[PDB]
A paper describes a structure:
In this study, we report a detailed characterization of ΦCjT23, an icosahedral temperate ssDNA phage with an inner lipid membrane, isolated earlier from a strain of Flavobacterium (previously Cytophaga). The virion structure determined by cryogenic electron microscopy reveals similarities to members of the viral kingdom Bamfordvirae that currently consists solely of dsDNA viruses with a major capsid protein composed of two upright β-sandwiches. The minimalistic structure of ΦCjT23 suggests that this phage serves as a model for the last common ancestor between ssDNA and dsDNA viruses in the Bamfordvirae. Both ΦCjT23 and the related phage FLiP infect Flavobacterium species found in several environments, suggesting that these types of viruses have a global distribution and a shared evolutionary origin.
The basic capsid building block is the pseudo-hexameric MCP trimer. Within the asymmetric unit, type 1 trimers circle the five-fold symmetry axes at the vertices, type 2 trimers reside on both sides of the icosahedral two-fold axis of symmetry, type 3 trimers reside on the icosahedral three-fold axis of symmetry (contributing one MCP per asymmetric unit) and type 4 trimers reside between the rest. We determined the atomic model of ΦCjT23 MCP to compare it with previously determined MCP structures. The improved map quality was sufficient to build atomic models of the trimers de novo. The MCP monomer is composed of two β-sandwiches, V1 (M1–T126) and V2 (N127–V239). The outward-facing EF1-loop is used by trimer 1 to reach under the spike penton domain, and analogously by trimer 2 to reach under trimer 1. The capsid-integral part of the spike, corresponding to the P13 N-terminal penton base domain (residues M1–F91), sits in a slightly raised position relative to the type 1 MCP trimers circling it. Second, pentameric spikes are required to fill the five-fold positions via interactions with peripentonal MCPs.
Author numbering:
A (entry chain C), B (entry chain A), C (entry chain B): 1 to 239
The structure:
């Protein structure tokens, strides 16, 4: 159903959804590569506190990239320059018992741009939900190690100051990769990232990289001071 | 093997094939979007018995869109502006027992256009065949309900007067869809519909929508007066 | 890791690799369709037994097209006009015990172009290796029958002299195809062959055709005298 449309204002109101939905359709007249600052926040209000957080001010570009990895890709039309379908459940849709509601908020929107949010209903119900988390670096240290066990997909920022990325697998082996090799391996599973309205296809964003994590327990970043490196990890778990 | 090449005339003769073929190849110098009124009729003729009707004056555009949904698509070359492969059986060629033949007819052709036909045979014989059926919703009526039990793929005409499309599933649940949401969901399975000669790709047709039906038993169309809504459904069964 | 960067010379020096790499990355500023005479040669020198010859002066175009069939395809970036990822092992990497090492060389390059080699390692080791072989049909031979049992992919040069090509399957059936039908069948598996820098995709080469051999035990070529035909076949086996 048509959840909301936003135009003119720089911040969407607290959008409330009561019926069970499983996926969100985000449409805009701004291209995917032109998203700069817009952020989204989605949660489920269970009652007297103890609400479930699925996304806390996650960047829209990272949210779109982390959800359209694989056979699918972002779409375009003659009326909308960017369409993306992002799922929130594994197979069916979120189940709300008595008074739970899904609250969605948009922040840092552009004044002269239009956005539209739609919700997709499903005939099934499920308790397996997707969770988004954010990790960063202090930007004043050369190297840092993070643990990515459980997560099956990551979106990393791309900068010229990142030298090495070390993957530590579940069997103890450690493999070092360069950004070029990382991008080449990334573009081997999902060759196409988006299709433009005119007909051209873009096979990758110039400053974001999608990494699938299979049997990977650790990621080490070897970089140089001067920039902040951001990772957005996606996981699936039962609430 | 090559079947026929048609030019100049507006009606192809009733071509007869005796070799057991498994699929057809349709090639023409007009793009897939440029097809307007061409119709195809394919059936199996038995010398002593009842005819087997697969397609009866089915639109060529709908036939191609039904047969080329999935990983594949319709391609193009320098000589031919449209090349498509259409499957007739499930995983083999149609088996002719005693006095069976395949009759193919093309009608409502354009005078100055070329239409070729090719046949593809397989080393296996199977009894599963694909059947095409046509359904309509009139223009003087507001809403309708059509039973789509047993089918797995439909193609609906696209008009600016359709309001809602409702799916009733096998478990009794009812889900309402907007045309925009339905198009977005349809493109979520097959991102690309055709590739042009220059290099640009077209991800859909402006007046056709392909609906993959899974465990759906009813479709309810809600619209306003002004146009006729046409559905072409495909099914698989044994003869 | 980075193996070598070749620029200015017409023959790359012999390169020795000691680490157990799993795949190679070929990057160059020459488009995929623009390669004419570049050749590669890879072989493993083993201190216990006999040396393993993987590629013996295989053309770069055929070597690249043999590895990028399926969902993957050769890509491009701003700096590099052609990037390809070619696997040398089935799932893991080549096993080297104590001193056995891989040796790679490039031949018949162009002085005013650029080439690079990258190596990709894997956390696992395997003995299943990929082998490339070359078959030839002379100019004075009207027809020729070859045994492609055990192979899984072939690359042929499209020529106007070739008239028919017949598959012989395991069950004994023989099916004859034309070049047009062969190309159409091939393009139904991998619709897109490469993506250029400006966003236009290319769905195939104008002089090379890729044939997937599934349950095929013989290939017969019928042509007219005048031209030579070359097949590049790929196979997987345990050493």
């Amino acid at each position: 159903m048509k959840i909301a449309t936003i135009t003119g204002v720089t911040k969407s109101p607290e959008l409330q959804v009561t019926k069970a939905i499983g996926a969100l359709i985000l449409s805009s007249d701004v291209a995917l590569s032109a998203l700069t600052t817009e952020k989204i926040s989605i949660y489920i209000e269970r009652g007297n506190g103890s609400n479930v957080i699925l996304a806390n001010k996650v960047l829209l570009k990272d949210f779109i990239l982390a959800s359209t990895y694989g056979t699918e890709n972002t779409q375009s039309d003659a009326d909308n320059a960017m369409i993306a379908l992002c799922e929130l459940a594994d197979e069916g849709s979120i189940y709300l018992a008595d008074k739970e509601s899904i609250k969605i908020t948009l922040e840092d929107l552009i004044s002269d741009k239009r956005y539209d949010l739609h919700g997709i209903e499903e005939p099934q119900q499920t308790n397996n939900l997707f969770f988004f988390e954010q990790k960063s670096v202090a930007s004043e240290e050369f190297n840092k190690k993070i643990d990515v066990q459980g997560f099956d997909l990551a979106i990393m920022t791309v900068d010229d100051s990142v030298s090495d990325l070390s993957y530590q697998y579940s069997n103890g082996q450690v493999v070092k990769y360069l950004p070029f090799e990382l991008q080449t391996l990334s573009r081997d599973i999902d060759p196409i990232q988006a299709v433009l309205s005119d007909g051209k296809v873009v096979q990758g964003l110039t400053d974001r990289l999608t990494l699938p994590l299979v049997a990977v327990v650790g990621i080490e970043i070897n970089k140089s001071q001067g920039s902040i490196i951001n990772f957005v990890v996606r996981c699936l778990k039962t609430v």
